[PDB]
C-alpha cells in the first residue's frame, strides 16, 4: 500500500506530482496537499499533488528533477505519504552548480533564483537540486542552508542568500542537462514502443530470470538522418542507467583487417562486464552492408563477425544492442532475422505537432518575442528533421545575438547573465534562419495525421457518412459485423469529374479517426513504372503496416495508363508492372492491421479493372460536380483567407457557375482576389474584394469539365448503377 510506479509527467514543475483520484482518496489527501516521496538510499523529496486525466491508478507522474533527487529511475516504485504539517520558511541559501554555470557572469540570483522563488511558494528540502532556464542557459542550483528543516515552502517574504563559490556536482546525483527523454520531441509513439521493450529487461532483470519469457535483444531504428535515432539511443541508456557504448561504421571501417573485428568484439565484451548495458551501432548499413553487394573480403568478414556477436547475446545477460540505419533494406538481411535485430521501429520524419515540440524543446532556454510563432514555422518546415529544426532555433538565436547583443557583449570569457536573459528572438530571426536552412529530408514522404476536417469540404454530406461507415464501423461495432457475417471492405475508389474534393475526403476521414495519412501521387507511380523499380511498391505498403492505423491513398490511378497513351497508346491491356505489385500487396494486407486503402481517378475507364474486384477497392463512390448549396459552401470556404465585401453575393455566383467544379470555383476566388490586388496596387501609382471583382472574374474563369465530359461522367456512373 501507498506504493506507486514512477513514470513521466506532463507537468514539468520541480515541486509537483500527479496522481489519479482513486489514490488521492486512498491516501486521504486533497488536490493541493503536500506529500513526501520516499525514494532510494534514504533520500526523500517534498511536492504538491495535483491530478489529470492521463495518470493511471498504479502510477505516480513526476519529472526528472524529482527522480534525480530521489535517486530513482523510470519504472521504479516509491512510497508516498501525506505531510499536512508543512509550513513556509524564513531564510534559504541556494547556490549554483559549477557544471551548469559556464559562459556567463553576474547576479545569478536576480536573473534566475528570484524569478524562480518569488511568489512561487515552492516546497523545497535541504540538498534538493532544481533547474532554472533562461538567458540561453540552463542553470541548476542546490539548496545548502535552511532555517526550518528538513523542508519548507519558500514564500515571497523569505530571505534568499546566494554567496559562495559554485558547487561541484556530487557523485550521487546526475546533471539535469544530461540527455534524457524530455529532450526528444516528435516520434513519441516510437519512443513509447522502445520503452516497453527496454525498460523491464534493464530496470527489473529479476522478472526475466524468474519468468519464462524471452527479452528483446536488439532494436533497429530507421529513417532519414537527423531525426533523433542517435538521440533516443543515448536518452534510453541515461534514463535506465545502463552502461552505454557507442559504435559507428566509419570508425570501425577506418581500422585495418583484424583491428576492426577486435574492436567490435571488445565493445560487446565491455557491455557484458558493465551489464546492464546498451550498445548502439550507428550507420548499420555502413558497418554491415549486404554481403551479396560487396566483393571485398574484409567487408564480408565484418558482417559475419557482427552476426556472431549478436547471436552471442544469448549468453551476455542484460545487454541490448540498438542500431540506426537510413533505410531498413540497405543492411544485410541476416541482421533482421529472428533474434539479432528482429525488432524495428520506424522513426521517419516528425509530423507538424512533433516539429513544433522540437522547436519548443530547443528554445526552452531562449527568450522569445511576442511575435514568434513556432507553430507556423513547424507547418512551413516541410522536409525538415529534428536536426534541421534545432539548427533553425540556433540560427534564429544567431540573428538575435548579432542584432542586439553584439553591441552589449565583450571579447572576454563570459557574458553578463542579466542582458542575456532579456535577449528575445524575433519572428524575422526565425524567418531568416528558415531561408538559410535546407531540409535534409525533402524527397522522403512525410506520413502524419492530416489536419483536414469535415468542415473543410463543401457538400458531399452522404459521402462523409459513408467513409465513417467504411473506416470506423468495422472496429467500433465488430459484434454486428460478426453477427450478420459481413466482410468489411478493404478500400474504396472514388471516380467522377475532377476538382470535387476527392483528396480532401480521404484526408478528412484519416483526421477524425486519428490515423496517419499516406499520399501516393502520380509521379511516384510513373517513376516506378518508367524505371522498372516496381519493387518499391512493397515499401509503400510496408509504411502503411508500420504507420497503422493509417489510410493508404493512391491518387491518379490512371497516371500510368495515360502515360501509355490513354485512349490510343499501345495494343496491350491495362495491366502493368506497378499495378501488379500494388494488387499483390493489397491481397497480402489484412484488415487486422487497421489499414484502409483509398483510390481516386478521374478516368476510371482506363484503369486495371482488377482493382475493383472483391478484396480490393470493391466499394465505388461517384463524386459529381457540387450542387447549388455545395458550390456556395465551397466559395465561402475558399474565401476564408481573404477579405470579402458585404456586397458580394456568393449564392448568385454559385447559381451561375452550374458547370464549375470546386477547383473551378477556386479559380474564380483566386481571380477575384488577384483583380482586387491589381486595382489596389494601381491606386498607389481596394481594402476588400468587391462584387465587381467577382463579376469580372466570371468573365475569365472557365469550367475544366466540358458538357461532353460531364455527360460521360454521369453515363459512366449510370452504367455502374
Amino acid at each position: 500500500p501507498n506504493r506507486l510506479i514512477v513514470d513521466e509527467a506532463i507537468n514539468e514543475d520541480n515541486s509537483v506530482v500527479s496522481l489519479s483520484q482513486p489514490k488521492m482518496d486512498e491516501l486521504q489527501l486533497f488536490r493541493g496537499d503536500t506529500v513526501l516521496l520516499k525514494g532510494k538510499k534514504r533520500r526523500e523529496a517534498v511536492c504538491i499533488v495535483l491530478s489529470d486525466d492521463t495518470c493511471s491508478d498504479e502510477k505516480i507522474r513526476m519529472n526528472r528533477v524529482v527522480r534525480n533527487n530521489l535517486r530513482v529511475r523510470l519504472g521504479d516504485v516509491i512510497s508516498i505519504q501525506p505531510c499536512p504539517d508543512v509550513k513556509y520558511g524564513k531564510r534559504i541559501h541556494v547556490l549554483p552548480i559549477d557544471d551548469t554555470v559556464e559562459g556567463i557572469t553576474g547576479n545569478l540570483f536576480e536573473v534566475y533564483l528570484k524569478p524562480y522563488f518569488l511568489e512561487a511558494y515552492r516546497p523545497i528540502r535541504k540538498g534538493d537540486i532544481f533547474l532554472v532556464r533562461g538567458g540561453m542557459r540552463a542553470v541548476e542550483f542546490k539548496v545548502v542552508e535552511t532555517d526550518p528543516s528538513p523542508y519548507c515552502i519558500v514564500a515571497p517574504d523569505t530571505v534568499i542568500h546566494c554567496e559562495g563559490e559554485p558547487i561541484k556536482r556530487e557523485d550521487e546525483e546526475e546533471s539535469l542537462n544530461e540527455v534524457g527523454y524530455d529532450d526528444i520531441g516528435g516520434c513519441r509513439k516510437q519512443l513509447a514502443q522502445i520503452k516497453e521493450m527496454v525498460e523491464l529487461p534493464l530496470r527489473h532483470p529479476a522478472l526475466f530470470k524468474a519468468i519464462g519469457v524471452k527479452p528483446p535483444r536488439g532494436i533497429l531504428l530507421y529513417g532519414p538522418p537527423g531525426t533523433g535515432k542517435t538521440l533516443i539511443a543515448r536518452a534510453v541508456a541515461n534514463e535506465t542507467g545502463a552502461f552505454f557504448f557507442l559504435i559507428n561504421g566509419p570508425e570501425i571501417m577506418s581500422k585495418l583487417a583484424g583491428e576492426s573485428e577486435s574492436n567490435l568484439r571488445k565493445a560487446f565484451e565491455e557491455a557484458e562486464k558493465n551489464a546492464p548495458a546498451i550498445i548502439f551501432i550507428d550507420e548499420l548499413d555502413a558497418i554491415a552492408p549486404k554481403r551479396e553487394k560487396t566483393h571485398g573480403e574484409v567487408e564480408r568478414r565484418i558482417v559475419s563477425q557482427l552476426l556472431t556477436l549478436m547471436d552471442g547475446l544469448k549468453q551476455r545477460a542484460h545487454v541490448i544492442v540498438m542500431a540506426a540505419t537510413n533505410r531498413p533494406n540497405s543492411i544485410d538481411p541476416a541482421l533482421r532475422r529472428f533474434g539479432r535485430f528482429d525488432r524495428e521501429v520506424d522513426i521517419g520524419i516528425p509530423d507538424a505537432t512533433g516539429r513544433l515540440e522540437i522547436l519548443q524543446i530547443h528554445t526552452k532556454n531562449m527568450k522569445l518575442a511576442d511575435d514568434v510563432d513556432l507553430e507556423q514555422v513547424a507547418n512551413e518546415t516541410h522536409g525538415h528533421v529534428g536536426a534541421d529544426l534545432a539548427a533553425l532555433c540556433s540560427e534564429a538565436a544567431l540573428q538575435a545575438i548579432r542584432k542586439k547583443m553584439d553591441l552589449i557583449d565583450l571579447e572576454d570569457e563570459t557574458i553578463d547573465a542579466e542582458v542575456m536573459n532579456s535577449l528575445a528572438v524575433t519572428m524575422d530571426d526565425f524567418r531568416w534562419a528558415l531561408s538559410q536552412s535546407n531540409p535534409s529530408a525533402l524527397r522522403e514522404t512525410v506520413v502524419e495525421v492530416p489536419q483536414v476536417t469535415w468542415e473543410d469540404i463543401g457538400g458531399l454530406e452522404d459521402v462523409k457518412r459513408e467513409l465513417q461507415e467504411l473506416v470506423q464501423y468495422p472496429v467500433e461495432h465488430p459484434d454486428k459485423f460478426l453477427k450478420f457475417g459481413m466482410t468489411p471492405s478493404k478500400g474504396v475508389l472514388f471516380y467522377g469529374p475532377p476538382g470535387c474534393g476527392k483528396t480532401l475526403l480521404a484526408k478528412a476521414i484519416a483526421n477524425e479517426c486519428q490515423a496517419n495519412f499516406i499520399s501516393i501521387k502520380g509521379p511516384e507511380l510513373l517513376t516506378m513504372w518508367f524505371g522498372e523499380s516496381e519493387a518499391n511498391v512493397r515499401e509503400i505498403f510496408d509504411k502503411a503496416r508500420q504507420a497503422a492505423p493509417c489510410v493508404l491513398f493512391f491518387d491518379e490511378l490512371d497516371s500510368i495508363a495515360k502515360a501509355r497513351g490513354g485512349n490510343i497508346g499501345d495494343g496491350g491491356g491495362a495491366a502493368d508492372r506497378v499495378i501488379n505489385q500494388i494488387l499483390t500487396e493489397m491481397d497480402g494486407m489484412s484488415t487486422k492491421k487497421n489499414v484502409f486503402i483509398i483510390g481516386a481517378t478521374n478516368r476510371p475507364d482506363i484503369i486495371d479493372p482488377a482493382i475493383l474486384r472483391p478484396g480490393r477497392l470493391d466499394q465505388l463512390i461517384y463524386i459529381p460536380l457540387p450542387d447549388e448549396k455545395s458550390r456556395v459552401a465551397i466559395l465561402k470556404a475558399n474565401l476564408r483567407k481573404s477579405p470579402v465585401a458585404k456586397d458580394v453575393d456568393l449564392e448568385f455566383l454559385a447559381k451561375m457557375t452550374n458547370g464549375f467544379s470546386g477547383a473551378d470555383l477556386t479559380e474564380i476566388c483566386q481571380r477575384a482576389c488577384k483583380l482586387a490586388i491589381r486595382e489596389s496596387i494601381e491606386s498607389e501609382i481596394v481594402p476588400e474584394i468587391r462584387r465587381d471583382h467577382f463579376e469580372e472574374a466570371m468573365r475569365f474563369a472557365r469550367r475544366s469539365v466540358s458538357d461532353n465530359d460531364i455527360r460521360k461522367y454521369e453515363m459512366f456512373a449510370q452504367t455502374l448503377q
Partner: peptide
C-alpha cells in the same frame, strides 16, 4: 492545510499560464 494550498495555488497559476 493553508500553507500547502498556498503552494498549490502558485503551482496551478504556473501550469494554467503555460497551458493558455
Amino acid at each position: 492545510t493553508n500553507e500547502a494550498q498556498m503552494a498549490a495555488a502558485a503551482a496551478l497559476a504556473r501550469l494554467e499560464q503555460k497551458q493558455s
